[PDB]
């Protein structure tokens, strides 16, 4: 419990900002692999834009 308690807010904060970041992107992020996929899509878009 203590461990979970120690990790309790950290997870929540992790979600909280994540949500905003997830909201900052039109696409909704649901998995760390999906997060990397969205990242690399963004990298490709940036490369094309430049």
């Amino acid at each position: 419990i203590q461990s979970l308690t120690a990790r309790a807010p950290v997870w929540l904060a992790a979600q909280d900002t994540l949500n905003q970041l997830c909201e900052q992107s039109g696409e909704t992020l649901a998995s760390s692999n999906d997060v990397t996929e969205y990242m690399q899509q963004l990298l490709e878009r940036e490369r094309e834009a430049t």
Binding site: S32, N33, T36, E37, M39, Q40, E44
Partner: protein
């Protein structure tokens, strides 16, 4: 004869462009598959310990 060297230099530049493009694409694919565990601690040492 003159244009021979021009074509050689153009081919070298084109190959450089292709190499840089392929390196960038490989890095993109990497980060797509890779960032989740990049730079994390080594498990093997922990498992042996």
């Amino acid at each position: 004869l003159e244009r021979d060297a021009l074509a050689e230099r153009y081919a070298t530049l084109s190959f450089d462009v292709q190499k840089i493009q392929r390196a960038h694409q490989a890095f993109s694919q990497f980060v797509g598959k890779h960032l989740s565990v990049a730079f994390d601690t080594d498990p093997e040492a922990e498992i042996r310990e």
